[PDB]
Design a binder for this molecule. Sequence first.
Ligand code: HEM
Length: 147
Amino acid sequence: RPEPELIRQSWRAVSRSPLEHGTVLFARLFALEPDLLPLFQYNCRQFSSPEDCLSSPEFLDHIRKVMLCIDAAVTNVEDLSSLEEYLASLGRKHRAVGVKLSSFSTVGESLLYMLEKCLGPAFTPATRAAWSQLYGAVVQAMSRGWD
Ligand code: HEM
């Protein structure tokens, strides 16, 4: 159970510009794991240009979906069991498109980077710990989807 106010007050800041913050998360994620980008080519409907896929409405829509999912976790920070079935279904969908479960740990590192970029020293160790616990719960629920 992550401290709710630390999660809510930090998420509120990133919610002011969710697409811009999501782009920052993905930029770190791709630098840490370059193999992830070719998975998005199918949604883009073209395999010739990674850069065109990165700037595509289809890629932006995925960023919007990711921010909505994190928003649902933040809304349910007090009880994440409500989203257990949905997160397992999300885990199934990612396994279906070739995503490895290990890449979700890399997404967690990118999320902390996005938050530190947005908040600076306001991203306190307690805030970082709260986000680590919340994200760890989200990936533990999504992990059951892989089975
Ligand atoms: C590891 C990086 C990620 C990759 C490679 C990835 C890949 C994908 C792909 C390829 C799709 C499209 C599936 C399809 O319809 O064919 C998708 C859908 C989706 N992704 Fe991700 N994703 C990643 C991270 C995340 C994260 C961290 C979340 C939030 C937990 C998320 C939330 C979603 C959602 C909500 C959809 C909904 C599409 C649907 O209706 O099924 N993604 N993902």
